[model samples]
Target: APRGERTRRRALERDIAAIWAETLGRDSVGPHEDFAALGGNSIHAIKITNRVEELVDAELSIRVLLETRTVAGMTDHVHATLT
Candidate 1:
């Protein structure tokens, strides 16, 4: 990947990790941890997407979130959003 893209992805990773931590009520969250396993539900997922939007400065689809279903998958989606 280009340097700019890599930078954006890293930034997104940080933002997503922070959002995950906020949603799961922890200081840190594992990249491999499932949102549901962290006590998340559809409502919390919506909250998560909303938080992501605030951090990334773009709208996020709940459908995309539901389909992604994993931290790595969601990270992929967020990185894609930068393009």
Candidate 2:
């Protein structure tokens, strides 16, 4: 990472964690916690992707979300896409 890239990466995780927390109706979410383990389902998955897309200013595939399935993982994927 160079310059602010690392900062952006961490920011992505904060955004991703917010999406997870909102979708799962929690006050906060751990970066590595499993979404499903947080009581999320397919519907919440859609909601999560939608919110994430809004945050990133791009469309997010539900397929990617299904596989990525964690705030930390989503941060990585979203950051990779942005870069």
Candidate 3:
């Protein structure tokens, strides 16, 4: 697999820790950090995506926060659609 074309992917979650910080604003922003673990629901989920469109850019219909449920994992899902 070509891991060389993978620099941009690194930036996704690097700044993404701040995205959830915009929503939760609790705990240190870490890749392994989870959304619901800090007390979550659908309310903040919508807020996260609302900003994400302008931040990373998207409006994916799936609303996939629960499955990923993490700052890093969400970046994975985020870039998947973005690409």
Given candidate 1, what's the lDDT at residue 67? 82
What's every prediction's RMSD, in angstroms?
1.8, 1.3, 2.2
- Model 1 residue 21 lDDT score: 86
lDDT by residue for model 1 over 1-83, one digit each (tens)?
Answer: 58977777777777787887887789988777877788888878988889888877888898666787766689788777766
Residues 1-83, candidate 3, lDDT per residue (tens digit)?
44743677778777767767767876556787677786767888887767777776557543567788887788888878776
Strongest candidate by TM-score: 2
Mark the regions of model 2 whose C-alpha exceeds 4 Å error after superposition. 1-3
| Model 3 ranges with Cα > 4 A deviation | 1-4
**In model 1, what are the clashing residue pairs, if there are any?**
none
Q: lDDT for model 3, on a 0 to 1 scale?
A: 0.73
Q: Cα lDDT for residue 58, model 2?
A: 98
Give the per-residue lDDT of model 2 (tens digit) for 1-83: 47688887998888888888877889999988887788888999999999889888999789767887778888898888887
TM-score of each: 0.82, 0.91, 0.78
